[PDB]
């Protein structure tokens, strides 16, 4: 949070792109640093390997880098996943009348509807287009 | 307008015959983004030595300052752009010009360490004694850096 | 026993251990490999134009060879004869108990002066309504060069004259380490040694590591040449 | 949106696009869900996307109202927004393929080069590529260009004169402009998260700066101003990296009437002219091809090698095979010609479907040549008298086939609906290779046979 | 709550007034960040990206994630709805449908075929019989590879009636002919019909799979859907 | 450590068990966490 | 085998007696003589 590219890359992307060793079957390796704090590392692999053994191996490297990331880094979490663009479906959720911003609806999405989607038959991953409340103090330099 | 704009990404660039045909439309050579950097500014910046030349000669503002008063001559001469340095100095750049901070051309030249350019800005009569808001000289940066040739020429 | 389960279980395991270890013992990389423990194959790296020292060479192979050679499939372990270079602050105690400061201070000035920070922006979400401006703003960023490091400001005096880092120590690029160093027929070298992935198949790796090999040799600097001093493979290839 | 654009610009241009739909295409949009600060080219307050959901299938009855029809309009109708690159377009079938014709080539620094040295090296391959509009078309950048950026120099002699220390500064400025995830909350028996941040009105513009204090050892507030100076500079909002070393990912495609391997040819050699230190690499769709196209030719060969020697061994003879394997063309003339009628491409579908129509086509002249071959063989006719006595009781089974199998594509083929692509692929390359495929190995099987027996008598 | 942040105590005057966090911050429930601003035809929105599970029914998930957002319906608070703006299932249910209705109609259509040539319902039934029993039996072997019914392998199925319908034509028809020709009766008919094609229809697979099998041996994300079409065509001409 | 069931499942087992969904071949999943702190997931795959 | 090695006993009282903490007293020992891993820089575009 706050990171520019170059600060995300120097910091994050460097150091776990200089642990990705011992990982078997890795044809190539891309990622991305941007303004936004965010780091994006895809490792694609040979087709007929396995993901599972591709995902422990590339998040058992990554969890021996984690000493090496800044503090701000470990505590967010950095998060390996199987690479997968198709979605079976994308549920909405609106507020007709005005009551709720797309926080407060996010917020009741994470709580009273997600987790029994995941929970669902054949739902094999669940995302959410938002995120879970946040206690947000706004400070004021004035009054501090 | 809409071809200012065109000329702050065309002098960005350094897309030379994209800005001759541009100056020949009427494009505004005084066009500044969100910053306030004019053609000028980006030319300074990226190097550009022939857009310098041709936008001064289209009545381009040489000592036009951005939001935080730094000028193409601070781009330049911080940047290491020594033709362009000599060419803005040459169309009545304020070698003694000042940003927010009270920074020069003088003290971003010394700091980067560019002696051809500290040689040109002191010809142009530049103040070697002017202060930063910090009371720092071109000699204290000089010295901070420990750029021995650099000291000698600033010591007068 | 599958290798891949068999590294699964122990670093499963090892990851219980790792917040138990010293924090020093964690920031150096702890490592779980499963390779075989004899060497594949020497990589050598030599200058014929006498123009980089060991040092230099070793440098060169830790930050533009090493990696893309650990990421090759087959490869288990790589060893670095040599070291890549660190910012070594070759402190003096004389001229550190000269301003009264101690390695404490020349830490905390590294920590503080050597920093890469996360500053936010100029005009960032949720922002005020009638926002024409955004930009990422740029504090303090790492230092790129010695000259920075000397740079460093410990202590300022009563009498206003500055105390840096150049002045309580030497400053210059060197080894992580200065306990390997190779020769190649006598003369300056630096290498990786190489062992084969558990179960990995020797010729197939020593094929991708020469590939791999391949792909650096264009933009290498003057003089650097590959040697290849110990190979396991050509004997197999051979005698088949 | 050009680059340094805010939220607020980018949510006036997407209301626009919404507007648009819901008025222009209310007969098709069912919906518009609007994502301010989303691309895929990468993230920032100057990127959206509008996803648009049509109405059912039924309810967009013509070529009019179908998905091809309305980007059309959309991208045009856009054409026309100041400030802004706003145009529709379709899925792919499947997303993760890309285009055919499309490459996808790094960029590499090799040699410690820097950002703004790969940033030169791009561009002198960007103008190369333009310079050869025959064979490259739509050669661009994947990533993002520099962008005004706001530097700010901490004074550490002042932060120490004054009694500031760094942690602080860093912080105040970090926390308040940055944001700060302190700790985690319970809010109705679920862990959150806890931010603190500065309220918007103070972390706007560069003069907001100068209004965050920071206490001092002795007590006192210091303003930023005191012992900050800032200046602005260009630098990268996205930094691509690939194998671990600095990259940019260029984009493009080969010309109208160009294959993939002669455009991938092109940007080799234009980028071997490239200043010191300047690598390249395939990657994607590109790695996939480079490594596919080399496996062709022995499946290809190995194909056509087992099914001669499976004809030789069925007919015992060296030669007459090829009077089988010369049926091949036959179905795949009317194939073409079918396809490109319609105006349909060279797809899996239509690959496929010659492979199926050159099987069937095989397989009719296979139990052509058995029948007058074992005539010959068995009961000592003559070459003519058993091939013209072959075809007569071939003829019937052969039309019957076809004539079912002819009006059982009928419908894939006129097929104007949900899936009609793949359909239409699928039968129209089929229909018009079937068509030939009958109409000629009927007269041209015999020819085969009769031509081949004679040249190996 | 924002109750008990607000009541943080950051400091105690001299006086003895207290500042809290109330005092100098604004305390709310927000989003973690702000970057995206989601909305559905002007209204605010939020949602769920759903993927399907590894060897799971695409049609049956759908289903059962309706079923779960119906029972969710009277827990809603007031103005919440949902919406469906991207789905994938009415599109595929579609899709197998169309293919599904081609099978059905192109053996109805060798029905009529067969009765208008042959001219006879005993003749017009073994094909009826033997085509299903192929198809049926495809997906079976289908299951032995462990492919799913999708969009290429059911495609695949349409590109190969041609020869599954060719094969049942080819021996009936021979059967009538030879019956027509030489009086014979209809079990010494088929014997000597057999005898005269059996040795070209195995001829016939062996030439197929020589065609088709190596479309299976394709490298990457194009050989993977070739591969689909290859084992879906040989599978079903091989049970022919 | 020193945590007690009610705020070990809260912070710790939902939190877990939210992302243990679509694993392949499991039949159920049972947990618990008491008042020492310590949360035991157990998750139970089919057959072979 | 066993080799000569140098055993330094720091006397805790002295240390409080004087009012130097044993961090600083084992951080001077073990940064000067054993070395200290500080933090990263960036070396030609390369952490190290
Ligand atoms: C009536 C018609 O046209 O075909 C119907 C009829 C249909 C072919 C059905 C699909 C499938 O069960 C079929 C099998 C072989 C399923 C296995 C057995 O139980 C058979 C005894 C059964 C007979 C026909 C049936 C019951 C149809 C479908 C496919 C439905 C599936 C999807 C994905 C929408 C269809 O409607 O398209
Ligand atoms: C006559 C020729 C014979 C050969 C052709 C055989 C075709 C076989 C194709 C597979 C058909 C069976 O496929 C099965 O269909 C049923 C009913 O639609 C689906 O059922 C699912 O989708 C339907 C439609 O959305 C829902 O109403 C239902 O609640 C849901 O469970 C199953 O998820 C699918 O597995
Ligand atoms: C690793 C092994 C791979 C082997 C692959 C080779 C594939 C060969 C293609 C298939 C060829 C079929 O081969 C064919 O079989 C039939 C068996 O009915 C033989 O038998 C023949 O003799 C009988 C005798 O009563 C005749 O009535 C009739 O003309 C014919 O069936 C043929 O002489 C032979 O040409
Ligand atoms: C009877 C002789 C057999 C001829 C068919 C053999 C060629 C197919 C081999 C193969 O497996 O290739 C698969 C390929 C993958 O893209 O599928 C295809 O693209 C279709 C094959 C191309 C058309 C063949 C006709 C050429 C006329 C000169
Ligand atoms: C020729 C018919 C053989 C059918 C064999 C079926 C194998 C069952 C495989 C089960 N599964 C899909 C889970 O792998
Ligand atoms: C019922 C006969 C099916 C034979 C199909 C043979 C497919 C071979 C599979 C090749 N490959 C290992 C790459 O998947
Ligand atoms: C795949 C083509 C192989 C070519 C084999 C040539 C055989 C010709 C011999 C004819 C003898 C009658
Ligand atoms: C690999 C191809 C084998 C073909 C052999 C043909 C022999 C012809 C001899 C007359
Ligand atoms: C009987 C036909 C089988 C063809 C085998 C092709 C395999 C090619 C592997 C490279
Ligand atoms: C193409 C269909 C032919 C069937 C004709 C009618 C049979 C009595
Ligand atoms: C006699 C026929 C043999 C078939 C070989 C596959």
């Not at chain 1, 990622?31 to 704090?37: C, F, K, L, Y």
């Not at chain 3, 300022?156 to 190779?182: C, F, H, M, P």
């Not at chain 4, 009694?163 to 402009?177: Q, R």
């Not at chain 5, 100098?24 to 929105?45: R, W």
Request: proline letters at 4%; aromatic letters at 8%.
């Amino acid at each position: 949070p706050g990171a520019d590219a170059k600060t995300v890359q120097d910091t994050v992307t460097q150091v776990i792109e200089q642990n990705m060793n011992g990982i078997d079957n890795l044809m190539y390796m891309s990622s991305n640093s941007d303004s936004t704090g965010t780091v994006q590392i895809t490792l694609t692999f040979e087709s007929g390997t396995d993901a599972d053994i591709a995902q422990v191996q590339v998040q058992n490297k990554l969890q021996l880098a984690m000493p090496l990331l800044p503090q701000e880094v470990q505590q967010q979490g950095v998060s390996v996943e199987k690479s997968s663009s198709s979605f079976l479906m994308v549920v909405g959720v609106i507020n007709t009348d005005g009551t709720m911003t797309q926080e407060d609806i996010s917020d009741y999405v994470a709580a009273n509807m997600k987790d029994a989607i995941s929970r669902t038959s054949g739902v094999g991953d669940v995302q959410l287009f938002g995120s879970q409340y946040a206690m947000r103090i706004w400070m004021n330099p004035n009054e501090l | 307008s809409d071809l200012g704009k065109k000329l702050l990404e065309a002098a960005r660039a350094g897309r030379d015959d994209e800005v001759r045909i541009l100056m020949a439309n009427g494009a505004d050579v005084n066009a500044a983004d969100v910053v306030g950097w004019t053609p000028l500014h980006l030319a300074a910046y990226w190097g550009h030595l022939e857009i310098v030349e041709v936008l001064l000669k289209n009545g381009a503002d040489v000592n036009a300052y951005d939001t935080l008063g730094s000028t193409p001559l601070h781009l330049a001469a911080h940047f290491g752009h020594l033709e362009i340095v000599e060419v803005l100095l040459k169309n009545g750049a304020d070698v003694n010009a000042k940003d927010d901070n009270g920074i020069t051309p003088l003290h971003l030249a010394a700091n980067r360490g560019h002696l051809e350019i500290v040689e040109v800005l002191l010809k142009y009569g530049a103040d070697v004694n002017a202060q930063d808001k910090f009371g720092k000289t071109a000699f204290d940066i000089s010295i901070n850096n420990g750029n021995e040739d650099l000291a000698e020429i600033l010591q007068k | 026993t599958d290798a891949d389960i068999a590294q699964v279980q122990v670093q499963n395991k090892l990851q219980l251990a790792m917040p138990l270890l010293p924090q020093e013992v964690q920031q150096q990389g702890v490592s779980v490999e499963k390779s075989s423990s004899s060497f594949l194959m020497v990589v050598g790296v030599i200058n014929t134009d006498g123009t980089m020292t060991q040092e230099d060479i070793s440098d060169y192979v830790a930050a533009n060879m090493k990696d893309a050679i650990s990421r090759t499939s087959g490869v288990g372990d790589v060893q670095l004869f040599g070291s890549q270079y660190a910012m070594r602050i070759w402190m003096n105690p004389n001229e550190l108990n000269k301003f009264q400061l101690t390695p404490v201070d020349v830490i905390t000035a590294i920590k503080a002066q050597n920093a890469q920070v996360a500053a936010g922006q100029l005009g960032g979400t949720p922002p005020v309504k009638g926002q024409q401006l955004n930009a990422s703003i740029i504090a303090q960023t790492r230092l790129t060069s010695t000259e920075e490091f000397g740079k460093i400001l410990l202590k300022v005096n009563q009498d206003g004259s500055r105390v840096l880092l150049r002045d309580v120590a030497k400053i210059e690029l060197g080894g992580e380490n200065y306990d390997i160093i190779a020769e190649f027929n006598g003369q300056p070298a630096s290498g990786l040694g190489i062992k084969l992935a558990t179960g990995a198949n020797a010729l197939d790796t020593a094929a991708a590591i020469r590939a791999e090999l391949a792909k650096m040799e264009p933009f290498f600097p003057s003089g650097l040449k590959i040697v290849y001093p110990y190979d396991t493979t050509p004997f197999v290839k051979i005698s088949i | 949106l050009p680059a340094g654009a805010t939220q607020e610009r980018t949510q006036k241009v997407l209301n626009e696009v919404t507007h648009y739909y819901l008025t222009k295409e209310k007969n098709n949009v069912e919906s518009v869900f609007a994502v301010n600060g989303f691309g895929f080219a990468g993230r920032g307050q100057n990127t959206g996307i509008a996803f648009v959901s049509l109405k059912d299938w039924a309810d967009r009855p013509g070529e009019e109202n179908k998905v091809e029809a309305i980007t059309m309009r959309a991208t045009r109708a856009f054409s026309q927004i100041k400030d802004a690159m706003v145009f529709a377009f379709n899925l792919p079938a499947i997303v993760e393929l890309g285009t055919a014709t499309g490459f996808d080539f790094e960029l590499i620094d090799q040699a410690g080069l820097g950002h703004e040295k790969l940033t030169q090296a791009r561009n002198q391959l960007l103008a190369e590529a333009a310079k050869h509009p025959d064979m490259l078309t739509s050669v661009r950048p994947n990533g993002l260009e520099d962008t005004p950026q706001f530097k700010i120099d901490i004074d550490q002699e002042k932060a120490q004169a004054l009694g500031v220390s760094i942690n602080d500064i860093n912080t105040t400025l970090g926390a308040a402009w940055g944001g700060s995830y302190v700790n985690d909350f319970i809010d109705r028996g679920r862990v959150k998260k806890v931010y603190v941040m500065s309220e918007a009105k103070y972390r706007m513009l560069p003069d907001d700066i100068g209004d965050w204090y920071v206490r001092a050892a002795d007590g006192q507030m210091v303003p930023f101003s005191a012992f900050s100076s800032s200046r602005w500079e260009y630098g990268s909002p996205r930094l691509e990296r690939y194998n671990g070393l600095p990259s940019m990912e260029i984009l493009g495609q080969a010309a109208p009437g160009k294959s993939t391997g002669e455009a991938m040819e092109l940007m080799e050699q234009l980028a071997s002219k490239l200043p010191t230190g300047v690598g390249y690499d395939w990657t994607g769709m590109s790695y996939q091809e480079r490594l596919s196209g080399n496996q062709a030719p022995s499946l290809y060969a190995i194909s056509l090698i087992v099914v001669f020697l499976c004809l030789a061994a069925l007919y015992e003879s060296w030669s007459i095979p090829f009077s089988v394997m010369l049926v091949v063309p036959l179905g795949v003339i009317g194939a073409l010609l079918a396809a490109t009628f319609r105006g349909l491409t060279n797809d899996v579908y239509f690959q496929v479907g010659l492979l199926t129509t050159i099987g069937l086509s095989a397989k009719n002249a296979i139990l052509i040549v058995e029948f007058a071959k074992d005539l010959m063989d068995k009961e000592g006719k003559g070459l003519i008298e058993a091939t013209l006595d072959a075809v007569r009781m071939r003829l019937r089974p052969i039309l019957m086939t076809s004539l079912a199998f002819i009006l059982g594509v009928m419908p894939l083929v006129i097929s104007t609906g949900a899936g009609s692509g793949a359909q239409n692929a699928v039968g129209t390359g089929v229909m018009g290779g079937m068509v030939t495929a009958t109409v000629l190995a009927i007269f041209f099987v015999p020819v085969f046979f009769v031509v081949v027996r004679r040249r190996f008598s | 709550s924002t109750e008990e942040f607000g009541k943080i105590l950051l400091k105690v005057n001299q006086d003895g007034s207290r500042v809290l966090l109330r005092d100098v911050a604004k305390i709310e429930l927000g989003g973690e960040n702000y970057d995206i601003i989601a909305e559905f035809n002007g209204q605010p929105a939020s949602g769920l990206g759903i993927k399907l599970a590894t060897g799971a029914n695409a049609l049956d998930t759908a289903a059962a994630i309706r079923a779960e957002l119906a029972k969710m319906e009277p827990f809603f608070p007031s103005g919440l709805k949902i919406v469906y703006p991207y789905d994938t299932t009415p599109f595929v249910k579609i899709s197998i449908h169309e293919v599904v209705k081609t099978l059905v109609e192109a053996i109805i259509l060798v029905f009529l075929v067969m009765y208008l040539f042959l001219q006879n319902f005993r003749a017009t039934l073994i094909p009826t019989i033997a085509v299903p029993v192929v198809l049926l039996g495809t997906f079976a072997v289908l299951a032995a590879f462990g492919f799913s019914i999708n969009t290429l392998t059911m495609f695949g199925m349409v590109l190969a009636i041609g020869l599954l319908v060719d094969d049942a034509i080819v021996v009936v028809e021979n059967v009538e002919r030879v019956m027509a020709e030489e009086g014979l009766p209809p079990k010494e008919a088929t014997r000597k019909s057999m005898g005269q094609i059996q040795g070209a229809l195995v001829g016939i697979a062996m030439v197929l799979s020589a065609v088709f099998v190596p479309m299976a041996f394709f490298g990457g994300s194009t050989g993977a859907i070739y591969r689909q079409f290859s084992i879906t065509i040989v599978s079903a001409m091989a049970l022919s």
